[PDB]
Design a protein around this ligand. Structure first.
Ligand code: GL7
Ligand code: GL7
Ligand code: PLP
Ligand code: PLP
Lengths: 830, 830
C-alpha cells in the first residue's frame, strides 16, 4: 500500500477490538447510531492508547537518568491535527488503514473530522510545533510550555469578498489527546505591591490566579520517545474570588470568576505586530510564572533532592536546565527567574544573575519596528511592581558595563538602555532578552547578519560571542511523509527510508535526475496531487478549476511586507495582456492566494477584498476562458496547507528583501516538488544556494539595492511614469474597473501604493513579471521543469528541523542529540 | 462480609485488571506516582464500565417497545456521591471491596474522595434524586431533565462563628459519570419581538444561546435498568456572538461569550424563598425550551415517525408523554408547549390546549408566600414576549370559565387571575400551573388538605378533580443499605433481602420487638454508628464528644419556620438548669445542629452565630462537664447526612404546625433507628399515624391552635411574662451573656422574638421542654428506648419513594410500575 508500516495479522485484529471497546465503553454508542465523528473518536482513542505506555516510560526514564532538560517557552504552538501524525510516528498508519477498512470505514474520511489545534498565528507558532517533533525525534529531554487557549486563531469566512472572523471553538467536542493534570495546579500572582523589610523585598497583597496544566504527548519518529507539551489553563481560586467579603453579591462573585479565567480564553491574532494590551501582558507573565515553578520543582528533585553536594546550590542549575525564549513573548522569564532566586531562595544578586544568563537563550524572529515589544512602564508598574524594580536594576548594572566598555559614549548609553524615554516610558523587551541570555540567534543567515549590522549592532560590539544563527527548518514527517505519501514512496523506492530522519540523504536523488522512470514518476505524483486538490476544491468549496494549468500559489498570512499586492499586479497584468491579444497562446495558470488578516489590520483586509475582486472579473470573462483563474483559498491553516503545498507548481516568496526573517512555507514547497519564484530574502538565499541559482527563479532588489533606494528616496511616481502596463493597472483600480458599484473602493490601496509604500512594490514590478515569463517558458517543457524540480527536492535536506535542532542542542543548549530507540513500549507495571 | 453481594472468583480478578487498565490507559499514571485520588478514579471508571452495557440496552429497549415516557423537569437534582450507590444497585460492593483490598487499598478511603453532586438546595432537590432512583427501580421509561450548574450549592465555612460561603467547584477534577453529548446541542431563544403575519405570529430577532446536553446514568436496584438524567449546559453560538459586526473589538467579542454561558454557571442558593432575578428566569426558560425540543423530537420518531395514522397528529402526544413540574420553576413549559404547537406545528388553540393540559402535571411544595413565584410582567415582556401573549390568552379563556361557573362573583375573578395587579403587575406562576395541568398535588396529607382549604381553595371549587396528594418518601437504597449496612444486615438476617425494593416488609420486624437478640443487635449497630461518627468528628473537624450521651440532632436548611431557635431555647434551658443544681443527675446529650443559610438571609445567618455562641459558653463550662455539648455541624450536605442520620438518637422536626409541607429528613431518621420529637406538621402526622402516637414524641400547637392564636393575635410578651425560665434566657441574650465582647450582638433575634415572630416560637416552648423531659426519661431505659425504635423502623415502610412513585405512576402518569429484571447486561454489538 506504501511504507506506512506493516499491516500485521495480530495487530489489525488487536486494533479492531480496541476500536470497538472505545466505541462502546468510551463513547457509549452502538454501531446503529454511531456517526463518522464517533468513529473518528473511537480510532483516536485507540491510537492514543499505543503511546501512553511509551509516554510513561519516557518520562520515568528522564527521571532515572536525569539529563539536562530543555524548556521551550512559547506563546504559540501551531499543532494542527494529530491523529495521522501519531500513526506515522508510531508506524501504525497501514495497520489502522487496514483495520478500519475491515470495519467498513474510510480512514481518510475520519481524519478530516479532526479539528485543527490552531494555537498559533503562522510561522512562529508552526516553528515551535516542528521543533517539538524534532526534539522528540532526536531524543532530547525537551518540554514545550505554553497556554491552552480555548479559542485559537479565528476561522476565516469570506462574505461578499470580505473576511469575516468567527470564534474557533476547537474544544467543542473535546480533545482526546490532552490529559488534564489538576493535581499539579500552581498559583500565579498579579498586582500587589513591594515591601522592603529587613532581609529582602516582599511581593505583597497580590491577586492570585491558578494555572492548571494539560499535557499533550509529542512522539518522536519511530524511536519510542514521547515527550510532553504542557499547556496552562487559567482558573480562579475559590476563596478570595468569593471570600473578599462585605457586600457585592454572592451570585455576582461567582460569575466574576470569569475574569481571572479570561487570561487563557483567546489567542491574540497578531502576526508580526505588537499590541500593548494588558490581557496580553497577563498571558505573558502567566505562562512564565507557572512554567518556572514547574522547572524549579523538577530541579529540586533531580539528584540534588537526594544528595549531591547537599545544600540547594543553584550553581548546577544551568547544567540541568536550559530555557529557550521563542521571541520576546516569554521575556519576563528573565526578571522572574531573578525574583525567585533573589527574593525567595535568597541568592546574592550576582550569583543569581550568573545563573540566569547561563540558562536563558533568546531567538529573534523579525526586524520590523511595529513587531517589537515595548511595554509601557505604567503597565508593568501596576501589574508587576517587583519585576519592574528588577528590570531597572538589571538595566543599571548593564549600562554600567557599557559605560566601562565605551567611556564617554553617551549616545550609545541611551540607545542600549532597556528603558526608552519619550512620550511614555517603555521597556524594550528585546534589549532585556539580549542582556539576560548567553545566546541570541537569528532564524536565517541574512537575518542574523542584519541583527549584527543593524538592529542590535551596539549589543554585538559589546558581546560578539552571544550572537549566532540557526536557520529554520521544517519536519519531513508532517511536511512530506504525512501530506505527500506518494512522493515519499517513490523516493523510498530508490533510496530507502532512512532519509525521513536524515533528510540530507535526499541528495542521492541527484543521480536519478536523468532517470527516465523517476522523472515520469515525480511528474505523476504531482499530477495526482493536483487532481486530488482540484477535487477537494469542488467538494468543500465549489466552482471548478483546471488541473492542467500551472498551480501558482502564495499562501501565508496577509501582510504588506509579504507583498500579496505585487502578486495581484502580476495577475492583472496577465489579464490585460490576454484581453489585448485574445487569440495568442499563453501557459494556463490557476493562481491561488490564501491567508488570514489580523482583525484590526485594515490594509490587509482591503487586500483580501482586492484579490476576490480581481477573481470576480477574471473568472467570468469569456475571452479568458480556462487560461486564467484567480482563487482565494479560504481559512488557510495547517490542515489546509497539507493539501495545497503538495499540489503546487509555483511557490511565491516575494517579500521585500530584508523583511522576511526566514520563512518556512518556502521550505515546505521546495521539498514537495514546486519551483520557487522569489527575492533574495530570508532563507530563500540559502535555498537557492543549496539548489543552485540556475534552479531557482530569483528576481528583484537585494538588501543593498533597497538601502540605496532609501538613501535616494523612494518615489513610486517615477515607476508609474515609465511603465505603461503598470500605469494601466493603477488607473483600472482608480476608476472602478474592479469595483463597479463602489468605484472608489480601492482608493486606500492606490493612495498607499503611490505615496506611502514602505515595501516598494513598484520597484520590483518589472523584474517580477519578466521573471514570471521565464517560469511560463520552462513550464512549457514538462521534462525540464520536472528535472529542475528534482534538483530542488534532492537538495532540500538542509531545511529539516532535525538539523536546526541538532545545532541548537550543540551550540546553545549543550546537549547531544541521539537517534537511539528507547527500550520498546513493552507493558510493565512497577 | 454483609450482603453487599457476592465476591466471586472470576469477577474480583476481572475487576482488578480493569482497575489497572484505567490507572494506566485512562489516568496515565503508574503505581509509583498514583495518589488516593487517582485510585478513586480508576475504580470509578471501572464501575462505570459495568453500567454502560445496561445503559445502552435500556435506552434501545425503550426505542423498540416505545412505552409512555415520563419527563421529570426540575431545576434541582441533589445527587450527592454516586460511586457506592452504583456498586449497591449493581450488586458490586463486596466484589469491589475484595478486589481493591487485594490491590492493597481501602475502598472506604477512596469513596471519601468523591465530590458531592450538589446541584440542589435541600428537600426539593433531594426529592428529585430519590424519585429518579425509584423510577429506575420500578422500570419506568423516565428521564430527569435539569441544568448542569458548574457551581452547585456553596460550601459552608464557619469563621469566628459566622458562615462563610465559598464556590463549590465540583468539576475541578472532572466527573467520570457524565457523558457530554455535543452532537445533540439545541438552540434556545431570548428577547426579540413578535410579528403577526397573515397565517400566525412569529417570534423574531431573538438572541440565541445553545444548550449542550450531558447524560448521567441512573441505575435501578438490581434490575438491569439504567435510565438517563439529562443536564443542559449553556454555550454561545460562534456566529452572532462574534458576527454581529461594526466595531467593538474581536477580543472583546470572544470574551463576551461568557454572558450567554453564565446561564448555567451557578445554582441560586435559595430554599423556600423567591428572588425575582433575570438570570433565574433565564435559567428557567433555558431548561424548559431545550427539554421540550428533545421531548417532541423523540415523539416525532416513536412509531408515528414510521406510520400510525400518518399525519403528525399530536392527539396521541398525551398518550406517549407525561411531564411532571417539580414546583413552579419549570412552569414556562406550559406556555412553551402551546407556543410550539400553535406557532410552529400550527394546531388550533383549543386542540393544543387540550394536549397541553393532558400531558402536564404540577407538584406544589410550600405554602409560605415569600416562596411563591410571581414574575414581574415587564421582565417577561422583555425576555419572552410571545410567552407573555400566550399567558394573557390562557388567562382570558380561564377567567371566562370561572365567570361562567360563578356568575357575578367579581372578587373571585381577580383572586384567581394569573395576572396580579398592583405596584407592579406580576404573573402568578402557581395559578398558571393549576390551569394548564390535569393534576395538582401536595407532598403530605395535611399539606394537600391545606391547599384545598386555603391557598388554592377557589381553584379546588372550580375543578375538584385536579387536586390530589402524594406523600413524599425516600429511597431505602441510599438512605438505609448504603449509609447503614450494619442495620440493613441484621434486618436481612431475620426477614431477608426482599424489603430493599419492598419496604412494607419491614412490618415483619414487629414480631421481633420482644426478641432479646434483636433488641441487643439493633442497639449494637446504633452504638457502632455513634462511635464511627464521634471518630469522624475528631478526624476531619477536631475537638471531642462523648458517644454515650444522647445524640440530639437537627439537620436541615436554616429557616425561621424550621425553628432552630426553638431548639436553641431548649439547649440554653438545659444549661441553666445544670448551673442551678450542678450535682443533680441529668441524661447527657450532644446536641448537633447543622444546616446552610442562604447568603442573603440575614436572620438565618444570625441564628448560626447564635448556635456557635451557645457552644462557646456551654462547651467550656467546667461545671457542665461532659453532660452537655453544643456542636454546629459544618457544611451539611447529602454525604454528611449519610453519616449523622445513622448515628442519631433523637430527630428534631419542630417546624410550626402548617409550615413544613412534608419534610423528608424526618423519614431518613425514622428508618435509621432514631426517635422523633416534633409537631403535627407535614409528614410527621403520617409517621406518628403509622408507628402509633405512643411511639412518637409529639408536642405543641396543631394547625387549628395556630389559627385560633392568629384570630386572637399573637403576643409574645404574655409568654415572656408567665415563664421565668423563658424570661431568664431572653435577658441572657439581651445582656451579652452569650456575646461578651459585643453585648448587643443578638438584639435582632430578641427584637424579632418579642415583636415579629411569624412562627410563634414562644407559644411552643413550654410543651417542648416538657416533652424533651419525657425523651430523657425513656433514654434512661435502654431496653424500652430500643423497643420503641424497633416500632418506628418496622413501621417506616410507607415512606419509601417506591410507594410514592408507584402512586404517581398510576394516579397521574397512567403507567404501570414493574419489578421485572431487564434481560441481563450481556455484551451484544449489533
Ligand atoms: C510572525 N512571525 C514572526 O514574527 N516572525 C516569523 O517567524 C518565522 C519563524 O521564525 C519566520 O520564518 C518568519 O519569516 C517570521 O516572519 C513569523 O512568522
Ligand atoms: C425548599 N423546599 C420547598 O420549597 N419545599 C420543600 O420540598 C420538600 C419535598 O417536597 C418537602 O419535604 C419540604 O417540606 C418543603 O419545604 C423544600 O425542601
Ligand atoms: C508554514 C506555515 C506558515 C508560515 O508561512 P510563511 O510562508 O513562512 O509566512 C504559516 N501558516 C501556516 C498554516 C503554515 O503551515
Ligand atoms: C433529606 C435532606 C434535606 C431535607 O431535610 P428536611 O429535614 O426535610 O428539611 C435537606 N438537606 C439534605 C442534605 C438532605 O439529605
Amino acid at each position: 500500500i506504501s511504507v506506512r508500516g506493516l499491516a500485521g495479522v495480530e495487530n489489525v485484529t488487536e486494533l479492531k477490538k480496541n476500536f470497538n471497546r472505545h466505541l462502546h465503553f468510551t463513547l457509549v454508542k452502538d454501531r446503529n447510531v454511531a456517526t463518522p465523528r464517533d468513529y473518528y473518536f473511537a480510532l483516536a482513542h485507540t491510537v492514543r492508547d499505543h503511546l501512553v505506555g511509551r509516554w510513561i516510560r519516557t518520562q520515568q526514564h528522564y527521571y532515572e537518568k536525569d539529563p539536562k532538560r530543555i524548556y521551550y517557552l512559547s506563546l504559540e504552538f501551531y499543532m494542527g491535527r494529530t491523529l495521522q501524525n501519531t500513526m506515522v510516528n508510531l508506524a501504525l498508519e497501514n495497520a489502522c488503514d487496514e483495520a478500519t477498512y475491515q470495519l467498513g470505514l474510510d480512514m481518510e474520511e475520519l481524519e478530516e473530522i479532526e479539528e485543527d489545534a490552531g494555537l498559533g498565528n503562522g510561522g512562529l507558532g508552526r516553528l515551535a510545533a516542528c521543533f517539538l517533533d524534532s526534539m522528540a525525534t532526536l531524543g532530547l529531554a525537551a518540554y514545550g510550555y505554553g497556554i491552552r487557549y480555548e479559542f485559537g486563531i479565528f476561522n476565516q469566512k469570506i462574505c461578499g469578498g470580505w473576511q469575516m472572523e468567527e470564534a474557533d471553538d476547537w474544544l467543542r467536542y473535546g480533545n482526546p489527546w490532552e490529559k488534564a493534570r489538576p493535581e499539579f495546579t500552581l498559583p500565579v500572582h498579579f498586582y500587589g505591591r513591594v515591601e522592603h523589610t529587613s532581609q529582602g523585598a516582599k511581593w505583597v497583597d497580590t491577586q492570585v490566579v491558578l494555572a492548571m496544566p494539560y499535557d499533550t504527548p509529542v512522539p518522536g519518529y519511530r524511536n519510542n520517545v514521547v515527550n510532553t507539551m504542557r499547556l496552562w489553563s487559567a482558573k480562579a481560586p475559590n476563596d478570595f474570588n468569593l471570600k473578599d467579603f462585605n457586600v457585592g453579591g454572592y451570585i455576582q462573585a461567582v460569575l466574576d470568576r470569569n475574569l481571572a479565567e479570561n487570561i487563557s480564553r483567546v489567542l491574540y491574532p497578531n502576526d508580526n505586530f505588537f499590541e500593548g494590551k494588558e490581557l496580553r501582558l497577563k498571558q505573558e507573565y502567566f505562562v512564565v510564572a507557572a512554567t518556572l515553578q514547574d522547572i524549579i520543582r523538577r530541579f529540586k528533585s533531580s539528584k540534588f533532592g537526594c544528595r549531591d553536594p547537599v545544600r540547594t546550590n543553584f550553581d548546577a542549575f544551568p547544567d540541568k536546565v536550559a530555557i529557550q525564549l521563542n521571541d520576546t513573548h516569554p521575556s519576563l522569564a528573565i526578571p522572574e527567574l531573578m525574583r525567585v532566586l533573589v527574593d525567595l531562595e535568597r541568592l546574592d544578586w550576582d550569583k543569581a544573575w550568573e545563573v540566569t544568563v547561563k540558562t536563558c537563550a533568546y531567538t529573534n524572529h523579525t526586524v520590523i519596528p511595529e513587531a517589537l515589544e515595548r511595554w509601557p512602564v505604567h503597565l508593568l508598574e501596576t501589574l508587576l511592581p517587583r519585576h519592574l524594580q528588577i528590570i531597572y536594576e538589571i538595566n543599571q548594572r548593564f549600562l554600567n558595563r557599557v559605560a566601562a566598555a565605551f567611556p564617554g559614549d553617551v549616545d550609545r548609553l541611551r540607545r542600549m538602555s532597556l528603558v526608552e524615554e519619550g512620550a511614555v516610558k517603555r521597556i524594550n523587551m528585546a534589549h532585556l532578552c539580549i542582556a539576560g541570555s548567553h545566546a541570541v540567534n537569528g532564524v536565517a543567515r541574512i537575518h542574523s547578519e542584519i541583527l549584527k549590522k543593524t538592529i542590535f549592532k551596539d549589543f554585538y560590539e559589546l558581546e560578539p560571542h552571544k550572537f549566532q544563527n540557526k536557520t529554520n527548518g521544517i519536519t519531513p514527517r508532517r511536511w512530506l511523509v504525512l501530506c505527500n505519501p506518494g512522493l515519499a514512496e517513490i523516493i523510498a523506492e530508490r533510496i530507502g527510508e532512512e532519509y525521513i530522519s536524515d533528510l540530507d540523504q535526499l541528495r542521492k536523488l541527484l543521480s536519478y535526475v536523468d532517470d527516465e522512470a523517476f522523472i515520469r514518476d515525480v511528474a505523476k505524483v504531482k499530477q495526482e496531487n493536483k487532481l486530488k486538490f482540484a477535487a477537494y476544491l469542488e467538494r468543500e468549496y465549489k466552482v471548478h478549476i483546471n488541473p492542467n494549468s500551472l498551480f501558482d500559489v502564495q499562501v501565508k498570512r496577509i501582510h504588506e511586507y509579504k507583498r500579496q499586492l505585487l502578486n495581484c499586479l502580476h495577475v492583472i497584468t496577465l489579464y490585460n495582456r490576454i484581453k489585448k491579444e485574445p487569440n495568442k497562446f499563453v501557459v494556463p495558470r490557476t493562481v491561488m492566494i490564501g491567508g488570514k488578516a489580523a482583525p484590526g489590520y485594515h490594509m490587509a483586509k482591503m487586500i483580501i477584498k482586492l484579490i476576490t475582486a480581481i477573481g470576480d472579473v477574471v473568472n467570468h470573462d469569456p475571452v479568458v476562458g480556462d487560461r486564467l483563474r484567480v482563487i482565494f483559498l479560504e481559512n488557510y491553516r495547517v490542515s489546509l496547507a497539507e493539501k495545497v503545498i503538495p499540489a503546487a507548481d509555483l511557490s511565491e516568496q516575494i517579500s521585500t528583501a530584508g523583511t522576511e526573517a526566514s520563512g518556512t512555507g518556502n521550505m515546505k514547497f521546495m521539498l514537495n516538488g514546486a519551483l520557487t519564484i522569489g527575492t533574495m530574502d530570508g532563507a530563500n538565499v540559502e535555498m537557492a544556494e543549496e539548489a543552485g541559482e540556475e534552479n531557482f527563479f530569483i528576481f528583484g532588489m537585494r538588501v543593498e539595492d533597497v538601502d540605496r533606494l532609501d538613501q535616494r528616496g523612494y518615489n513610486a511616481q517615477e515607476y508609474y511614469d515609465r511603465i505603461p502596463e503598470l500605469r494601466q493597472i493603477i488607473e483600472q483600480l482608480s476608476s472602478g474597473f474592479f469595483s463597479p458599484k463602489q468605484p472608489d473602493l480601492f482608493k486606500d490601496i492606490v493612495n498607499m501604493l503611490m505615496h506611502h509604500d514602505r515595501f516598494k512594490v513598484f520597484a520590483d514590478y518589472e523584474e517580477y513579471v519578466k521573471c514570471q515569463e521565464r517560469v511560463s517558458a520552462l513550464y512549457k517543457n514538462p521534462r525540464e521543469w520536472t528535472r529542475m524540480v528534482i534538483r530542488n527536492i534532492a537538495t532540500s535536506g538542509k531545511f529539516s528541523s532535525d538539523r536546526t535542532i541538532a545545532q541548537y542542542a550543540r551550540e546553545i543548549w549543550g546537549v547531544e542529540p541521539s537517534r537511539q530507540r528507547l527500550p520498546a513500549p513493552d507493558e510493565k507495571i512497577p
